[PDB]
Design a protein around this ligand. Structure first.
Ligand SMILES: NS(=O)(=O)c1c(F)c(F)c(S(=O)(=O)CCO)c(F)c1F
Ligand code: NA
Ligand SMILES: [Zn+2]
Length: 258
């Protein structure tokens, strides 16, 4: 009886194994665009993915993730609200059973069909496992997906998903360029928060881009053919793997723009 997304082990139950679920800096949150404050001291984000080295794609039983070689300073995120350098470790998505839900963050209560998270860890902490013990250990870049035109840079990901249908499957996934997943603008909101899955650690500086990317109905329908179950177990489609918005509490969301 591990955690997951269902009636019996979903977000409303996680607090019993992970009491920080009721903490003061939980994610995701609703971004109220009217109350987010423009902060002229923020910088433009620096997204430097030119040397990114993807290695593998994995169905974790909760989502799928594309992992990178983060044993050297290749693909990094800096600037914006961040102090120092954050190295890209992996990206993953959360998505819905229907095009009207699936994102973790919301914008003026709007839900998007999915949300991409690019997870980076602060190199001052030496590796990821140390970084997630720190209040400024991770920086997660969040990008909304809406359904419309296909995203060409997503198709390599979509087409390998049939090889990782079930929990614990991986496949080689080299030479994938995550720049193809980024919208035109790097305008963003930022706030201090948490992992959105157990253990829900409060170690994340969230940077959520305002501009969603467009993906096609067929691309997101291929996400929904993944399975939460292992091979040889009853089929449970991997859909609705998002945590709802959590209370903002004593936090301010800052805007990098207008
Ligand atoms: N959705 S999210 O981006 O907040 C997220 C992470 F990025 C994340 F890294 C973890 S983790 O548990 O440390 C394992 C993944 O690297 C998470 F638990 C987690 F929830
Ligand atoms: Na190395
Ligand atoms: Zn995530």
């Amino acid at each position: 009886h591990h955690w997951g997304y269902g009636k019996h082990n979903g977000p409303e139950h996680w607090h019993k194994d992970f009491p920080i679920a009721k903490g003061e800096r939980q994610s995701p949150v609703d971004i109220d665009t009217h109350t987010a404050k423009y902060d002229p001291s923020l910088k433009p984000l620096s997204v430097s993915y030119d040397q990114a080295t993807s290695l593998r794609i994995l169905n974790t039983g909760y989502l799928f993730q594309v992992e990178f070689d983060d044993s050297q300073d290749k693909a990094v995120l800096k600037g914006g609200p961040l102090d120092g350098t954050y190295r890209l470790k992996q990206f993953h998505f959360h998505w819905g059973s229907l095009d009207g839900q699936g994102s973790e963050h919301t914008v003026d209560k709007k839900k998007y069909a999915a949300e991409l998270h690019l997870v980076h860890w602060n190199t001052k902490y030496g590796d990821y496992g140390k970084a997630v013990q720190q209040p400024d250990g991770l920086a997660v870049l969040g990008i909304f997906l809406k359904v419309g035109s296909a995203k060409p840079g997503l198709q390599k990901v979509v087409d390998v998903l049939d090889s990782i249908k079930t929990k614990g499957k991986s496949a080689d996934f080299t030479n994938f360029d995550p720049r193809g997943l980024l919208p035109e603008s790097l305008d963003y909101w930022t706030y201090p928060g948490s992992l959105t899955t157990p253990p829900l650690t409060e170690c994340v500086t969230w940077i959520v881009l305002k501009e969603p990317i467009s993906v096609s109905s067929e691309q997101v329908l291929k996400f929904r053919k993944l399975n939460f179950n292992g091979e040889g177990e009853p089929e449970e489609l991997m859909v609705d793997n998002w945590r709802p918005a959590q209370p903002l509490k004593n936090r301010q969301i800052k805007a990098s723009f207008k």
